[PDB]
Design a protein around this ligand. Structure first.
Ligand SMILES: Nc1ncnc2c1ncn2[C@@H]1O[C@H](COP(=O)(O)OP(=O)(O)OP(=O)(O)O)[C@@H](O)[C@H]1O
Ligand SMILES: Nc1ncnc2c1ncn2[C@@H]1O[C@H](COP(=O)(O)OP(=O)(O)OP(=O)(O)O)[C@@H](O)[C@H]1O
Lengths: 440, 440
């Protein structure tokens, strides 16, 4: 969440910037004034509590003097108990005020960076840049790597290669369940390992996250809307955990409660996160939008003064990555009304799917400034100063496979993207269609 | 489960072999006579039901004749309703008899193969064979690949390499939670990919299983004892699934309801299963016994007449695999009293851990004959004949890493097992200790 002081003009805050940000988000603006009011009540309680402390101390010292003089203290004792019963109420109320104030500040989204388009309609997404392999004229229904007609959808290509099994997958696990088979397995591992190797050559530290999280730690890194809709709950006898939606959740908590006291030399810290990811929400056919999948994720901690530069570095890496796979794409600046609570700025890389004949999102890159690190108490250098946290998909591997399948197809099978060959037993340059489709 | 006919002498069965098997297992023997009795009640109900069918038909035809002659039928109608009310009770009872009989047969373990030692004490495990790399004198506290003193435990080696993080893992996920870091990540992927490549060169089909299963399909492949103790339940809004304990569960269901009608040409089918695995039960320090981990699993379907030969083939593969990693091991024949319900025979490969100074299980290999395929209706050729199912771990990768860490350690770091090098960015032959331990 934002700092409490950001709401308070008297403590150097700017409640107006916050109201403007809420408006760009399409979220509640009255929430800011509510918070400011609650803050004053809470301060009143702090003062009253504090004055009660001092009055009790006094009335204690007078009661001691009277017991010294061997004099009755029935009147002082009565006042001591009056003050004390009050201190009790006050204590109970201050705690409830603190509790509600924190819950309210928790609903306020991060400050939307000025560079972001003010809009609730994705039509207005900034078109940041576009990229094409040089042997590919323009985005159309042509598979970019082969020049061949993008005749088959990713689901169709995968099936002809005998690379996956949705039919047996659904019978066994339900909606969108699947097995990967043969080269479907090798392509998936190829991406995981190429992704790890790629990021690691850029100084990222490979980091395999666990895929369950304690409820309480999850709650500090993901918004209220996520649990009761997106996350699988896991039953552990009597305990509950969540399956993670992305390794960004557990990896963001990695340095919770730590302190980069010498930021210049210690930061930035860069992680090449790898894990499976689980989503309750996933709806066509194929492995494009499914309930379980693997993701190589970029996660970075930087000094506050360096995050925007890092943000550019990060999207740069994902671009360099898709270029290396020869996949055309565009980068778009997500409109304010579509940012999640933690993001001050978000870019998506959407790669071209030539059969679908549209750009579809493969990568999402966000500067979350100190919104999560504040919660997680991840401090930075020498009111309190936290690190900034950025996260950017490197590759959601099953979805990246889909894009590959459509762009690497040709009449008789699939060209294997050059960079992935060394990761595949036999380093094949090409694999043939094994199966005919029913349709035709 | 076993065939119902296996309990019935009159239908060619051998209830005595079954009682003997239950005794070797240490499970209930009276259960066999119970089943035989229930079977007779059920047959009585079938006959009564059948006789009621015929009597109703008759009384129907007499009632029609009377309505033709325009004669009163108050006496026949009364008998029709008597017979009919009875047919109702009978129907309700036959269903309940069928239900209980099936539940009872479901508790009876597979027939323990004669070659298995009859005993409830693992002390009596058959010592099948032993193997040592030739440069390694004998199993002792010496790291087998380097000749160096096995001075550090796997947990200690991993930590000095900065290859994992149990401390941050526990904070985030709880008991035994961990991240893999750096080379810990690369070693894990190295094993997954080497395992896939190894099995695939032997004609196994790589197959990545999903890690959730519908309750109902899980129940057909795993015993009663497993759910209410070993398996994580997953909450999907209102639905429930399980996280799998091993890819053998979903892969065994892969061909549920199918029919290998030309077994000679169609079988055997061999799968190199890969998935993560989740276990509620996991307890020292380290990644040896944890709640989540990866496993390359061998799964094979064969004709009944070929399973024992295949069984030897399968354990042969895991042995060849550990030999290639240079890890000393022994193969042991698990005593009857320790077989799970589905196994007729089980071999474990236990690799030498030179710091622990003991053999610890890395691989488990079981011929389950047709015990599961009967449930899953996986038929074989031209009373009903099913395929046999065998499963054998190729590598539980985190645990295999532990064995490697202890055997590949030396004074200043870890030798990287030769076969894994090509799977690791930079193909290092050696990696240095990065961290000192507190202890010393
Ligand atoms: N259900 C899914 N199945 C497969 N891959 C997915 C799924 N959901 C997301 N991904 C992959 O993860 C990447 C980012 O997903 P995530 O939800 O973290 O991004 P986001 O910030 O929510 O972006 P958006 O809101 O546009 O989805 C996507 O580019 C996509 O490739
Ligand atoms: N909790 C765990 N953490 C890590 N690896 C495990 C765990 N449990 C099992 N394994 C690995 O899986 C392999 C087989 O485990 P599984 O439970 O399927 O075998 P099993 O037939 O039950 O043998 P046993 O009863 O001796 O454990 C083992 O050899 C071990 O390497």
């Amino acid at each position: 969440m934002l700092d409490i002081n950001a709401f308070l003009v008297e403590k150097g805050g700017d409640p107006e910037i916050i109201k403007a940000s809420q408006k760009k988000r399409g979220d509640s603006v009255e929430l800011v004034d509510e918070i400011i009011a609650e803050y004053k009540e809470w301060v009143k309680l702090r003062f009253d509590l504090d004055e009660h402390n001092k009055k009790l101390n006094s009335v204690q010292k007078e009661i001691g003097k009277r017991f010294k003089a061997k004099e009755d203290a029935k009147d002082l004792i009565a006042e001591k108990e009056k003050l004390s019963n009050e201190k009790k109420e006050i204590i109970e109320k201050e705690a409830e005020a603190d509790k509600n104030l924190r819950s309210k500040i928790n609903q306020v989204g991060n400050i939307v960076h000025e560079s972001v388009v003010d809009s609730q309609d994705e039509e207005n997404n900034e078109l940041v840049r576009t990229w094409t392999p040089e042997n590919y004229k323009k985005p159309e229904q042509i598979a970019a790597a082969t020049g061949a007609p993008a005749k088959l959808s990713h689901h169709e290509v995968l099936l002809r290669l005998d690379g996956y099994d949705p039919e047996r997958g659904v019978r066994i696990v339900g909606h969108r369940g699947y097995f990967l088979r043969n080269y479907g397995v090798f392509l998936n591992q190829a991406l995981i390992n190429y992704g790890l190797s790629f990021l690691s050559s850029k100084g990222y530290v490979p980091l395999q996250a666990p895929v369950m999280m304690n409820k309480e730690v999850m709650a500090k890194t993901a918004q209220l809307s996520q649990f009761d809709e997106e996350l699988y709950k896991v039953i552990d006898g009597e305990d509950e955990k969540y399956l993670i939606a992305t390794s960004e959740q557990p990896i963001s908590a990695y340095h919770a409660g730590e302190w980069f006291e010498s930021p210049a030399e210690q930061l930035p810290v860069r992680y090449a996160g790898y894990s499976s990811c689980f989503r309750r929400e996933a709806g066509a056919w194929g492995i494009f939008r499914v309930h379980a999948f693997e993701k190589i994720e970029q996660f970075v901690l930087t000094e506050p003064e360096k995050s925007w530069e890092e943000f550019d570095r990060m999207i740069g890496c994902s671009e360099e990555f898709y270029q290396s796979l020869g996949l055309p794409y565009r980068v778009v600046g997500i409109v304010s009304g579509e940012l999640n609570n933690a993001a001050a700025k978000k870019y998506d890389l959407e790669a071209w799917f030539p059969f679908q004949q549209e750009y579809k999102e493969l990568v999402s890159c966000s500067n979350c400034t100190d919104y999560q690190s504040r919660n997680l108490e991840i401090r930075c250098g020498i009111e309190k100063k936290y690190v900034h946290c950025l996260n950017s998909t490197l590759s959601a591997t099953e979805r990246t496979i889909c894009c590959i399948l459509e762009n690497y197809q040709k009449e008789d099978g699939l060209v294997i993207p050059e960079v992935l060959r060394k990761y595949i037993p036999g380093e094949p340059e090409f694999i043939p269609y094994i199966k005919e489709l029913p349709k035709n």
